[PDB]
Amino acid sequence: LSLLYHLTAVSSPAPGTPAFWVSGWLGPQQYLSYNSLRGEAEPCGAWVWENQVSWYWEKETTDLRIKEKLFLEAFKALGGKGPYTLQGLLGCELGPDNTSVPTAKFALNGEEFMNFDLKQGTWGGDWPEALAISQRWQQQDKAANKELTFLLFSCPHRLREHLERGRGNLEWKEPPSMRLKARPSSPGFSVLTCSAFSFYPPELQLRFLRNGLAAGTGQGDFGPNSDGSFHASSSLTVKSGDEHHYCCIVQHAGLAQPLRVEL
């Protein structure tokens, strides 16, 4: 399990729009939400009902707030009329021997450029506008400090405290709802499209059979529903008329065996 925060500031928010915002991810589950027109970190989905160390948010909040000041101040450290886009990937994964591996990288308008080095306790990267922000934040009182705390304490403490308190959530298995439909290609051709609805966790495998023998996985496509369960589909081209010989096979955690999906 990894606890990761996605952090985003843009120089010019479009009107009525968070100049900064963050979401917190326990794995592929979003536990925390924080824009900047609320200055308040809040739980999402199941994680709202977690019995927490309660004074847990007021550290999430103060943390994220302090993080936003610095973010919107990286902009000032910056050259032109822009506008800019500055991104945070910050957290830690926990692994088998009671350990944390911390993570800290940043990008500039979709391009990666800064990283927090923790041996040296700093904000590195040699390409120019790196130096720049590194140094505003460098020469800024105990921010370098406030990070390490974040990265070696606050993160592992938080993650360990989700693992104990919402373990059950982490391991929700919802089986996908299946559907195999056919639509038409060039005459002489048709496409089968096995569509999987709802479903969590995300790992899921689809494939195709013509009379039982394997006849390809297809073109595949993936994305989220809003309860944070998921959606998946694969399409496959077949000889028009050969249709009903085919079927779709879904493989997913919510299932005991694999499952057949007839047309």
Binding site: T8, T85, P224, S226
Partner: protein, 99 residues
């Protein structure tokens, strides 16, 4: 750099002409994060329409789900229009049913 959106459009559950459902239009790949996304019943954008928070994939590309409740009868044709600095005019993605 600039990165052009991939757009998908699917219901939450299996489409069943008659029961309450949920239409999702999900946009994923783009950058900058500035984006207008709207859900058309038949032609007109829809009123009560939520949209989850905005995140980004392992290469900083933002992704953004918009969604709304609904109910389809083989009258209506719901679809997803999206405009962004990189698309040249809107793309509309007709919500192909049971896919």
């Amino acid at each position: 750099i600039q990165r052009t959106p991939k757009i998908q459009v699917y219901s939450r559950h299996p489409a069943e002409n008659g029961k309450s459902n949920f239409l999702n239009c999900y946009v994923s790949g783009f950058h900058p994060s500035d984006i207008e996304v709207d859900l058309l019943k038949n032609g007109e954008r829809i009123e009560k329409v939520e949209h989850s928070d905005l995140s980004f994939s392992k290469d900083w590309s933002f992704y953004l789900l918009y969604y709304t409740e609904f109910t389809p009868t083989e009258k209506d044709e719901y679809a997803c229009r999206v405009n962004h600095v990189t698309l040249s005019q809107p793309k509309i993605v007709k919500w192909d049913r049971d896919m």
